Scaffold this active site. Sequence first.
Site, PDB file in Angstrom:
ATOM      1  N   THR C   1      32.695  37.442  49.001  1.00 42.15           N
ATOM      2  CA  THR C   1      33.212  37.265  50.418  1.00 42.15           C
ATOM      3  C   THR C   1      32.429  37.835  51.630  1.00 42.15           C
ATOM      4  O   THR C   1      31.822  38.900  51.548  1.00 42.15           O
ATOM      5  CB  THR C   1      34.595  37.911  50.507  1.00 42.15           C
ATOM      6  N   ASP C  17      34.464  33.224  55.243  1.00 38.48           N
ATOM      7  CA  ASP C  17      33.902  32.133  54.453  1.00 38.48           C
ATOM      8  C   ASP C  17      34.986  31.613  53.505  1.00 38.48           C
ATOM      9  O   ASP C  17      36.129  32.059  53.574  1.00 38.48           O
ATOM     10  CB  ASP C  17      32.649  32.583  53.694  1.00 38.48           C
ATOM     11  N   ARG C  19      34.389  30.887  49.858  1.00 36.51           N
ATOM     12  CA  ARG C  19      33.978  30.947  48.456  1.00 36.51           C
ATOM     13  C   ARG C  19      34.792  31.991  47.707  1.00 36.51           C
ATOM     14  O   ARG C  19      35.041  33.075  48.224  1.00 36.51           O
ATOM     15  CB  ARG C  19      32.491  31.284  48.343  1.00 36.51           C
ATOM     16  N   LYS C  33      40.927  32.510  53.121  1.00 36.87           N
ATOM     17  CA  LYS C  33      40.915  33.974  53.159  1.00 36.87           C
ATOM     18  C   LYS C  33      41.623  34.552  54.377  1.00 36.87           C
ATOM     19  O   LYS C  33      41.827  35.764  54.462  1.00 36.87           O
ATOM     20  CB  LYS C  33      39.479  34.476  53.114  1.00 36.87           C
ATOM     21  N   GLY C  47      37.642  41.218  48.364  1.00 40.95           N
ATOM     22  CA  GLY C  47      37.879  41.997  47.151  1.00 40.95           C
ATOM     23  C   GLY C  47      38.629  41.194  46.111  1.00 40.95           C
ATOM     24  O   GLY C  47      38.355  40.012  45.922  1.00 40.95           O
ATOM     25  N   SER C 129      30.961  41.413  50.510  1.00 36.20           N
ATOM     26  CA  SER C 129      29.588  41.462  49.997  1.00 36.20           C
ATOM     27  C   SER C 129      28.554  41.047  51.044  1.00 36.20           C
ATOM     28  O   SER C 129      27.421  41.534  51.027  1.00 36.20           O
ATOM     29  CB  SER C 129      29.447  40.574  48.754  1.00 36.20           C
ATOM     30  N   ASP C 166      23.950  35.729  51.512  1.00 32.92           N
ATOM     31  CA  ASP C 166      24.690  36.399  50.438  1.00 32.92           C
ATOM     32  C   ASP C 166      25.183  35.383  49.409  1.00 32.92           C
ATOM     33  O   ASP C 166      25.828  34.394  49.764  1.00 32.92           O
ATOM     34  CB  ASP C 166      25.873  37.187  51.011  1.00 32.92           C
ATOM     35  N   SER C 169      28.924  34.701  49.058  1.00 34.43           N
ATOM     36  CA  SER C 169      29.564  33.966  50.145  1.00 34.43           C
ATOM     37  C   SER C 169      28.994  32.562  50.247  1.00 34.43           C
ATOM     38  O   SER C 169      27.831  32.331  49.903  1.00 34.43           O
ATOM     39  CB  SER C 169      29.358  34.701  51.464  1.00 34.43           C
TER      40      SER C 169
HETATM   41  C1  LIG Z   1      33.681  37.200  47.855  1.00 38.35           C
HETATM   42  C2  LIG Z   1      33.673  35.719  47.388  1.00 38.35           C
HETATM   43  C3  LIG Z   1      33.217  37.948  46.611  1.00 38.35           C
HETATM   44  O1  LIG Z   1      33.094  39.318  46.991  1.00 38.35           O
HETATM   45  C4  LIG Z   1      35.170  37.682  48.220  1.00 38.35           C
HETATM   46  O2  LIG Z   1      35.271  39.103  48.111  1.00 38.35           O
HETATM   47  C5  LIG Z   1      36.345  37.076  47.427  1.00 38.35           C
HETATM   48  C6  LIG Z   1      37.623  37.466  48.139  1.00 38.35           C
HETATM   49  C7  LIG Z   1      38.603  36.293  48.380  1.00 38.35           C
HETATM   50  C8  LIG Z   1      38.599  35.193  47.296  1.00 38.35           C
HETATM   51  C9  LIG Z   1      40.018  36.890  48.472  1.00 38.35           C
HETATM   52  N1  LIG Z   1      36.514  37.692  46.116  1.00 38.35           N
HETATM   53  C10 LIG Z   1      36.585  36.992  44.986  1.00 38.35           C
HETATM   54  O3  LIG Z   1      36.435  35.776  44.895  1.00 38.35           O
HETATM   55  C11 LIG Z   1      36.884  37.836  43.763  1.00 38.35           C
HETATM   56  C12 LIG Z   1      35.647  38.580  43.364  1.00 38.35           C
HETATM   57  C13 LIG Z   1      36.071  39.572  42.475  1.00 38.35           C
HETATM   58  C14 LIG Z   1      35.942  39.391  41.100  1.00 38.35           C
HETATM   59  C15 LIG Z   1      36.362  40.382  40.219  1.00 38.35           C
HETATM   60  C16 LIG Z   1      36.913  41.562  40.707  1.00 38.35           C
HETATM   61  C17 LIG Z   1      37.047  41.748  42.079  1.00 38.35           C
HETATM   62  C18 LIG Z   1      36.626  40.756  42.959  1.00 38.35           C
HETATM   63  N2  LIG Z   1      37.338  36.929  42.706  1.00 38.35           N
HETATM   64  C19 LIG Z   1      38.538  37.074  42.135  1.00 38.35           C
HETATM   65  O4  LIG Z   1      39.343  37.966  42.406  1.00 38.35           O
HETATM   66  C20 LIG Z   1      38.874  36.025  41.093  1.00 38.35           C
HETATM   67  C21 LIG Z   1      39.756  35.016  41.765  1.00 38.35           C
HETATM   68  C22 LIG Z   1      39.937  33.852  40.785  1.00 38.35           C
HETATM   69  C23 LIG Z   1      38.615  33.107  40.568  1.00 38.35           C
HETATM   70  C24 LIG Z   1      40.980  32.881  41.351  1.00 38.35           C
HETATM   71  N3  LIG Z   1      39.567  36.693  39.991  1.00 38.35           N
HETATM   72  C25 LIG Z   1      38.865  37.138  38.947  1.00 38.35           C
HETATM   73  O5  LIG Z   1      37.647  37.019  38.839  1.00 38.35           O
HETATM   74  C26 LIG Z   1      39.646  37.866  37.872  1.00 38.35           C
HETATM   75  C27 LIG Z   1      39.613  39.327  38.213  1.00 38.35           C
HETATM   76  C28 LIG Z   1      41.028  39.842  38.060  1.00 38.35           C
HETATM   77  C29 LIG Z   1      41.031  41.253  38.200  1.00 38.35           C
HETATM   78  C30 LIG Z   1      41.967  41.999  37.481  1.00 38.35           C
HETATM   79  C31 LIG Z   1      42.012  43.387  37.594  1.00 38.35           C
HETATM   80  C32 LIG Z   1      41.125  44.053  38.433  1.00 38.35           C
HETATM   81  C33 LIG Z   1      40.192  43.325  39.159  1.00 38.35           C
HETATM   82  C34 LIG Z   1      40.149  41.939  39.047  1.00 38.35           C
HETATM   83  N4  LIG Z   1      38.880  37.682  36.648  1.00 38.35           N
HETATM   84  C35 LIG Z   1      39.148  36.741  35.743  1.00 38.35           C
HETATM   85  O6  LIG Z   1      40.085  35.946  35.820  1.00 38.35           O
HETATM   86  C36 LIG Z   1      38.134  36.740  34.581  1.00 38.35           C
HETATM   87  N5  LIG Z   1      38.705  36.488  33.236  1.00 38.35           N
HETATM   88  C37 LIG Z   1      38.879  35.035  32.988  1.00 38.35           C
HETATM   89  C38 LIG Z   1      39.378  34.870  31.597  1.00 38.35           C
HETATM   90  O7  LIG Z   1      40.637  35.510  31.634  1.00 38.35           O
HETATM   91  C39 LIG Z   1      40.499  36.951  31.684  1.00 38.35           C
HETATM   92  C40 LIG Z   1      39.930  37.294  32.978  1.00 38.35           C
HETATM   93 MG   LIG Z   2      24.622  27.805  44.824  1.00 36.49          MG
END
Ligand SMILES: *[C@@](C)(CO)[C@](*)(O)[C@H](CC(C)C)NC(=O)[C@H](Cc1ccccc1)NC(=O)[C@H](CC(C)C)NC(=O)[C@H](CCc1ccccc1)NC(=O)CN1CCOCC1
Ligand SMILES: [Mg+2]
Lengths: 233, 233, 226, 211, 196, 196, 222, 204
Positions: C1, C17, C19, C33, C47, C129, C166, C169
């Site tokens: 993000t 953004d 993503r 978001k 996050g 990020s 980034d 993003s």
């Molecule tokens: C930018 C894009 C990245 O920094 C932004 O910050 C966005 C924020 C927006 C979307 C609110 N962040 C994310 O996209 C975020 C990045 C992330 C990943 C992991 C930890 C923290 C932040 N992504 C997520 O939160 C995704 C959202 C899904 C794709 C809809 N969720 C996951 O990746 C989960 C993580 C859940 C989690 C639990 C406990 C503590 C921390 C995180 N992961 C999974 O589902 C992976 N896995 C799939 C198979 O089943 C078991 C879990």
């Molecule tokens: Mg690409």
Amino acid sequence: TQQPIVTGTSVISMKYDNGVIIAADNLGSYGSLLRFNGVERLIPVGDNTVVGISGDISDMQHIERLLKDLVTENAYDNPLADAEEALEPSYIFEYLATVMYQRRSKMNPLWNAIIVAGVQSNGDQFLRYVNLLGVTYSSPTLATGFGAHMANPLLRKVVDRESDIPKTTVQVAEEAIVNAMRVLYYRDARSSRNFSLAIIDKNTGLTFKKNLQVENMKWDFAKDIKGYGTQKI
Amino acid sequence: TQQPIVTGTSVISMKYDNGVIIAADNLGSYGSLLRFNGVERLIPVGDNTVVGISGDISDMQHIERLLKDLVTENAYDNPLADAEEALEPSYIFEYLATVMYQRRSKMNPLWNAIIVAGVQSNGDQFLRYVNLLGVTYSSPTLATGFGAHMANPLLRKVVDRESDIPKTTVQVAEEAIVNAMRVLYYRDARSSRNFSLAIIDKNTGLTFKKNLQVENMKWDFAKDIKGYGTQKI
Amino acid sequence: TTIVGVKFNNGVVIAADTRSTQGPIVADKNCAKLHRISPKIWCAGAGTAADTEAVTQLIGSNIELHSLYTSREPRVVSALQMLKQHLFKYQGHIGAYLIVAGVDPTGSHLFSIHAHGSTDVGYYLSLGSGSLAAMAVLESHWKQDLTKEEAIKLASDAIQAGIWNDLGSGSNVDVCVMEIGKDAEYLRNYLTPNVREEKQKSYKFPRGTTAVLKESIVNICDIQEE
Amino acid sequence: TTTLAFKFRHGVIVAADSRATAGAYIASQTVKKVIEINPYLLGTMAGGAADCSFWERLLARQCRIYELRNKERISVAAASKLLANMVYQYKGMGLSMGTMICGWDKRGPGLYYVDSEGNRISGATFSVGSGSVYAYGVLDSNYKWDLSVEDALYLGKRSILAAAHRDAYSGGSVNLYHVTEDGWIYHGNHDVGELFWKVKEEEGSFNNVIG
Amino acid sequence: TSIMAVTFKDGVILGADSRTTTGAYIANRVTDKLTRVHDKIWCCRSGSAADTQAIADIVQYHLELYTSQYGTPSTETAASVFKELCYENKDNLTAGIIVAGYDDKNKGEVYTIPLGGSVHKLPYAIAGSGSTFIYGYCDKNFRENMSKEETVDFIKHSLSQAIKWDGSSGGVIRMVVLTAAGVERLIFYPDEYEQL
Amino acid sequence: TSIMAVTFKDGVILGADSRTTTGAYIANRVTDKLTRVHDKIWCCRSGSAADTQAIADIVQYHLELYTSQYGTPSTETAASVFKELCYENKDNLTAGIIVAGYDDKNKGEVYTIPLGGSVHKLPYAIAGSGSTFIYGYCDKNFRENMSKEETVDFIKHSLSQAIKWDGSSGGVIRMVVLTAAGVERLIFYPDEYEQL
Amino acid sequence: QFNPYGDNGGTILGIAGEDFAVLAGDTRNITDYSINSRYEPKVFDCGDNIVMSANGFAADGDALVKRFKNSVKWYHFDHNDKKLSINSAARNIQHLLYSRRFFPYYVYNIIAGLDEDGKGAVYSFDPVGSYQREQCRAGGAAASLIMPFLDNQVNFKNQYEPGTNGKVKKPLKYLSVEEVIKLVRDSFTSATERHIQVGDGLEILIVTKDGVRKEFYELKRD
Amino acid sequence: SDPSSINGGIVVAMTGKDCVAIACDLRLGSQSLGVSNKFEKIFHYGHVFLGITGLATDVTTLNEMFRYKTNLYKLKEERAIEPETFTQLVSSSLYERRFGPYFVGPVVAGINSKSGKPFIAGFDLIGCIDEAKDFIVSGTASDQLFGMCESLYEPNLEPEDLFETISQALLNAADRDALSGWGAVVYIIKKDEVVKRYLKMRQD
Ligand SMILES: *[C@@](C)(CO)[C@](*)(O)[C@H](CC(C)C)NC(=O)[C@H](Cc1ccccc1)NC(=O)[C@H](CC(C)C)NC(=O)[C@H](CCc1ccccc1)NC(=O)CN1CCOCC1
Ligand SMILES: [Mg+2]
Ligand SMILES: *[C@@](C)(CO)[C@](*)(O)[C@H](CC(C)C)NC(=O)[C@H](Cc1ccccc1)NC(=O)[C@H](CC(C)C)NC(=O)[C@H](CCc1ccccc1)NC(=O)CN1CCOCC1
Ligand SMILES: *[C@@](C)(CO)[C@](*)(O)[C@H](CC(C)C)NC(=O)[C@H](Cc1ccccc1)NC(=O)[C@H](CC(C)C)NC(=O)[C@H](CCc1ccccc1)NC(=O)CN1CCOCC1
Ligand SMILES: *[C@@](C)(CO)[C@](*)(O)[C@H](CC(C)C)NC(=O)[C@H](Cc1ccccc1)NC(=O)[C@H](CC(C)C)NC(=O)[C@H](CCc1ccccc1)NC(=O)CN1CCOCC1
Ligand SMILES: [Cl-]
Ligand SMILES: [Cl-]
Ligand SMILES: [Mg+2]
Ligand SMILES: [Mg+2]
Ligand SMILES: [Mg+2]
Ligand SMILES: [Mg+2]
């Protein structure tokens, strides 16, 4: 479970013919930083007891408050609070020792080593030690931390056993304590020159001396020391 | 295997129509301590190359000596040392890149990130990066450490791709570099206000600017900021 | 993000953004978001995606009940206080990094909030990020006494910096403008600089290509009469 | 992987799947796990693809220089032992090999199991790989010495199929070989996808699966 | 430890405390950390006592051999030999050294060599655990081309504070004056410097 | 951080830098670390931003409730509430706080509360990562009963050095003057204090 | 502790035709969430009508290519300018990789060219030298995204002929260079959408009897 | 060890013109071992369909849980639940186990009975909603499915065309995953008719 932050070093003490002496420096260290230079680590309780504390200063300040509250509580519904039912050194010690052992038994100790020095109602000398583990012992001389390693040997040369206590005067005992404090200043990296000294005599009562300094130090021989082996200049 | 002790932060650079620009601050940090304030991290090699180095300063001083010795060695039995057989930016870079990869392959790296900036014989701009892992890449803009995160985005707004290079003048490129150095001073906790800047042009040659300062800073808005949420005074 | 917040003359603007990632994989190319806490209080979140939603829906629910109880329009400081105390209590385990902005009877406000419960005040802020790429732009182009139009430009330029530079993003830019004395305008997909080009070929298959074993009608209706 | 080999009256059968894996990801499905060392010697591969490939190719070169100096084809026992001694030098260093050296020599058909742990075993029936445990059931239950070449080839094929079905890290296709005293004979590449359905219908097995 | 070296009009002065520790125990309270590697090239030692002694001994050997062949070495040359040892053996050493010397041509020079093995030529230098507490004081009070008396007071006051706040520093303040006139050793006791 | 509080003739002055970091990234360069818990009782915050904010908010609540029942609280009372929180929750907190306030009876008072939760009443106090570099400077330059102008210069010069040497300190120098006259906020920018 | 390895991202793809072969790869170089270069070539003409791409840890990939190019040079010197066949190069590369079995080249590697019968050839290598000739192969970050698509659109897997219902497969008709380049661009455009380490640009090297030709196409820069 | 990959499995959903499709593999395993080839991962509550991947015990548990909750919803509301509403219920239910989550990857698919609008959505294990217009993927071969869907998919496909697209996406993704396969099912969903087709695939 914690770790000590702001700390106080050695507390030293000994018995003599008519009472007890106890001493401790005025420093509150923050690791290797000699942060606080005006810290009193000898805390009088009435006119017959002095509690000397080493270790964590925040826990010392907590204990200091428990003792202040103990005096307040003892006076409650007690017409003889300044006489027969006044606080004794043995009462004050057992209370602290109870608290210290209970805190270690909950895995949340008071990170201190404590020496309770005083004179009882019947004129008997009281000197006992307690620490963060709840461990207690008594001896003619007692010392905490570095003092246990450096002061006790010097003080035990004056009072080596129980029978040496009546033969030891207050002038000799004070002289020994003051010398020990000098030695600790030479050799303990977490010590200060400034210290406090307290005497509890069965005749003359409690004498509390502040702002004492280590004096009559030997440094002149340092000028002749050159290099670490072969160097001459 | 080691750890870096005295360190240098970001080195930033970019191409423009007739050459390249490179810049780096004059600080040698010792962890959080801003220990050394007069450290030159841009090192010219001849009149056609500037090597900008970040990371461990002791390893930087080692590399600086290797380069000085490289010039000495190239002149040996070489009548064209100041002409056709002079050192090129591409020669200097490949040598360093060879050393860096060999050192990582012995598990004893030179803890640095290096940008070699210069102009070749045929007038072509040279700008390539190499680090402690032996990893190399080239781009219209290059930056190390924090500069990669903060400077590159700003410099890529001027030169987003190869075709933007001829459209970019030295005045515009320098302005962008100087602005990036200001931003890094706002935001990098291991940066300094004082920095050095070097321009290598195919026409006007090597221009080395020392004792530059970040100026035209914005701080006045700070007076209106009070508390962390609810506080008004 | 990448998310930002920028104050201006008569209000405040936030942007983000679109993503959302799962490691190196893009799970959603058009994620939303920008969250609404109350009609004129919006927050952008970075996050853990579920945490930024859940924490926002919760405080927004309690803010609505508070507004009804007090017969007053909700304040940004209330949302701020309720959020930080909630996040502090969970000691960072709720991974919500938010930029909270809005207008209320007190005026226009802009705050940032971290997962451990610390808040910050500013005229311009950035989280996620891509916060460094965005802050580089903000530090280069921000000035005092910005107009609404200048602030929207600065904010979207800051998000673009994150989108391009980034890897965490990408895709589109969302914006929400909160001006004093006006309705808040939520500009979903304000910019769309990442449309996919036409594919070279169509991969539509001939009917009958896939091998089948059995067929059956699925009864989705309830139990019938007669 | 799943690989097997067994001695019988008319020589030795060698069979193997073709799947290669990198975690859950199926990287390849066209891998030759049987290496032709000489017209009378075969080697099987299981575990580290790179390890098995390198050391067995290096062995084939040792076996060739042997033939040049000695005017005599190397024995199955000597070949298996050269490999075993080669991998023993690197014991504990991380090598991952599970191999079978199959051939026909002066003592008749020969079959040795060799691995990176240090084992070197002569035997009439072997199976190594993650799916070996499934293959052993079919082998042990149907294995004779008086087996026809046709029936022996089918047994080795059917055994891999059993493992390819159950084991997630086994499948792709079945490679068959038959080693005689006149040398080895390749008996084709058989896709498990097609082979499974064929066997199901003709044999009646895998009744639990629908098709 | 607390160590420093300061250049001035007539040359350079080295300064140091006299404490060496084993944890919180003071193993020696009258240590001489100002060591001679050549007639008018001295060093201040901080870090491991064993490492810094071993290094200084090797350097003294190198410069003694240099002198026998090429005559009096420069202060820069001495600093280079220190560096070469500290840099090439950085994985196995814990030594923070300040090199100071007097030439007639170059006059007073000071080089500091921290942990990594880097070299830094400076007007004055401070090092050791106790130096942290006097970065502000020294920066504010240092001037170039001070007199001998001014420089002695500057070092005396600086190390006084370092000793005051650092438990790993203490004892006496030793100093070594390096000028054209020769080599002068100075010593200042607690009663003198504590009351400053 | 770099924070300090200094008593003087007419009252007390608090001072602080404006930097908050996440590793080496400066998350905010215009932070206000001087926070108000009562009209003329303020605090300087160092350590965790979350912890120190949570604490200061709770204290402001306690003193607001104290005032409603018992009238204006003393600076000692405010320091006690801080202590109680910092000491009882020492295992879960990372907060170094300096409490400063003005009474008409007691005048200017300063209490420092380091990590353990101990309390220390002092004429002046320094804290934060950057304070280490100015222990020597502050000890040498502090006097009791200074004027307002003298005290402002003392803090300005002290924090200038702390900022100069500490990477975790920087930005602007904020100050808050607490006297009978009222509450005055001061700010000093880099161009002013860097050239000192 | 010093980690001698890194991940520079990137993805590559090799497809073999009837009388040609292609080797494609994106031009993006990265560390963590930062972009190092939007155009950093990854596929090289190594001589003798052979193209090669080794990457993952860029420094190890650059070294391997550099060594193989050197191996080709010395093959000419030592064997009378003889042409290094694709099968001989593959075996040579195995030995370059296994020489570091106990400190591996952290890379995916693919070479492409023409075999000795003039037909297209693609060879794939694991980090320690296990190699396979294949018709279609993707390697790198988005390999798992692309390969299933190629199984379907190059080898016609799970595709049957309508009307028969699973009884008769789709026949394996060969692909033209123009049809192949479409699959390549669609593969990388799809991978760019769902993988963050893939983007910026796409460079394709086509190998025929006439020589080695290049084609470049832009990809999304987010 | 990784709960999300012990049992294996995949689910994929796609939108079309006035239709949706949801598909899954039939495998249940214990790591390398294949245990069942009849473990369907798609359930329906009225006209709303739910596919669940991940840990099999949690798949079974959540099905029983949503059957419970939707049966009560219906008794009180006097109507079947809609996909948009059900999607919020799934998110709510998963986040209530934020610090002790179900190890699943759910996928919702259905057509709003009132508006007639096709709807799909995906979730992470703690409840975050991914409401997509084109397709949703989940499982051990999610990377493979993203690659197939992103290249094969095109908007406004007719039911019988959509069937072929989703089937090929699933089949070819499953054949590049060791932990997926052993059969497959595809649901084709229209506003008032639903067809279910079992696919013929390789059994290895
Ligand atoms: C930018 C894009 C990245 O920094 C932004 O910050 C966005 C924020 C927006 C979307 C609110 N962040 C994310 O996209 C975020 C990045 C992330 C990943 C992991 C930890 C923290 C932040 N992504 C997520 O939160 C995704 C959202 C899904 C794709 C809809 N969720 C996951 O990746 C989960 C993580 C859940 C989690 C639990 C406990 C503590 C921390 C995180 N992961 C999974 O589902 C992976 N896995 C799939 C198979 O089943 C078991 C879990
Ligand atoms: Mg690409
Ligand atoms: C059955 C199929 C599985 O048990 C068989 O045993 C086959 C035998 C055939 C291939 C000869 N074995 C494998 O498929 C084997 C399993 C394995 C993996 C790793 C170590 C030992 C055994 N797979 C491999 O050898 C693969 C083959 C590739 C996919 C063509 N190779 C790798 O996974 C390589 C080799 C790694 C390696 C070995 C020794 C030292 C250093 C490295 N690794 C990678 O490519 C890196 N890997 C890529 C996927 O993402 C994770 C990192
Ligand atoms: C000040 C004190 C800090 O910088 C000065 O720099 C002085 C410098 C003068 C003496 C040269 N430094 C010391 O006094 C030095 C401090 C120190 C300690 C440990 C490592 C590095 C520096 N002290 C020593 O070197 C003492 C000298 C002995 C007492 C004569 N040595 C030790 O303390 C030895 C050190 C052994 C060692 C450990 C790690 C790396 C190198 C050497 N330690 C012990 O004997 C056991 N000791 C007590 C129990 O705790 C473990 C250490
Ligand atoms: C100076 C900086 C040093 O004493 C000052 O004291 C200031 C005081 C003001 C701001 C109150 N302190 C800080 O800036 C403080 C320094 C710090 C850092 C970590 C722990 C304690 C103190 N900074 C912060 O608190 C930041 C503020 C955020 C950016 C708004 N917070 C963090 O760095 C958080 C804290 C999490 C935490 C860790 C350990 C104990 C308590 C809390 N840390 C992170 O976000 C982790 N971060 C990201 C990944 O890289 C590691 C760092
Ligand atoms: Cl010594
Ligand atoms: Cl703060
Ligand atoms: Mg001292
Ligand atoms: Mg600073
Ligand atoms: Mg499968
Ligand atoms: Mg299988």
